Design a protein around this ligand. Structure first.
Ligand code: OLA
Length: 255
């Protein structure tokens, strides 16, 4: 019944707001236009004046900054996952598996919320780092954000809002096809109800957006490709910068 799907949609949106401090609605308010103006980092001096007003070569300091934020993001996504009805009742090994594969797909989905074609919000929206400053970073660190920006510009053209995204990232998490899952069926049963909820949600929230449900589902392909490229790029780092620490939570996820 639709009433149950609407209650599930409302539950997830509530947990999403409770779990993710910087929503898309806020990020768009910062990006579009007086109390919320971000300081803009577009070069070496702005970084310095940024590392002062926002608050060890620079390409590496920026890299380890991204890693720290990814870890914080894994923590937020883990919190959100526990609210998805049924998730914590699954075999503990399947919970770990679902988070291990799902977490970076969610990270780049939600990172799109903080992006426009020209750059990305950082430091809880207090800063804005330009796409060209990142693309200009020393090899191989300059190829690192560009595939995310390319995904975001397309993904953002779907014009989803946070309430849509709350259901979509839940769908992503309850993926029965992750390698090594022990009990695929109850995961699939949860995802099917989530899919029904998403379908109704896009119908009501975007009545004129034909086949938006299908187009959203097809984006789950671009997500997979970003991870694969990202994982390759890290292996290059591991060999060229043997002095660079990589956070253990991220190490474990990637293993
Ligand atoms: C310089 C301060 C933070 C700048 C962040 C720029 C983009 C914001 C978020 C980045 C997280 C995703 C980028 C890839 C992270 C590398 C480590 C990892 O998650 O495996």
């Amino acid at each position: 019944e639709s009433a149950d799907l609407r209650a599930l949609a409302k539950h997830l949106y509530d947990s999403y707001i409770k779990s993710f401090p910087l929503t898309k609605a806020k990020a768009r308010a910062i990006l579009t236009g007086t109390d919320k103006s971000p300081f803009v980092i577009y070069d070496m001096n702005s970084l310095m004046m940024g590392e002062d007003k926002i608050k060890k070569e620079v390409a590496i300091r920026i890299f380890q900054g991204c890693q720290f934020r990814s870890v914080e993001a894994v923590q937020e996504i883990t919190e959100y996952a526990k609210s998805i009805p049924g998730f914590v009742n699954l075999d503990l090994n399947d919970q770990v598996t679902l988070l291990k594969y799902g977490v970076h797909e969610i990270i780049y989905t939600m990172l799109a919320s903080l992006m426009n074609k020209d750059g990305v919000l950082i430091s809880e929206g207090q800063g804005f780092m330009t796409r060209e400053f990142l693309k200009s970073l020393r090899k191989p660190f300059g190829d690192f954000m560009e595939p995310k920006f390319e995904f975001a510009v397309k993904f953002n053209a779907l014009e989803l809002d946070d309430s849509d995204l709350a259901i979509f990232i839940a769908v992503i998490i309850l993926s029965g096809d992750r390698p090594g899952l022990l009990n695929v069926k109850p995961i699939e049963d949860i995802q099917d109800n989530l899919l029904q909820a998403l379908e109704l949600q896009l119908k009501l929230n975007h009545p004129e957006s034909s086949q938006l449900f299908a187009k959203l589902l097809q984006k789950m392909t671009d997500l997979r490709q970003i991870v694969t490229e990202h994982v390759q790029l890290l292996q290059v780092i591991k060999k060229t910068e043997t002095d660079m620490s990589l956070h253990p939570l991220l190490q474990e996820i990637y293993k």
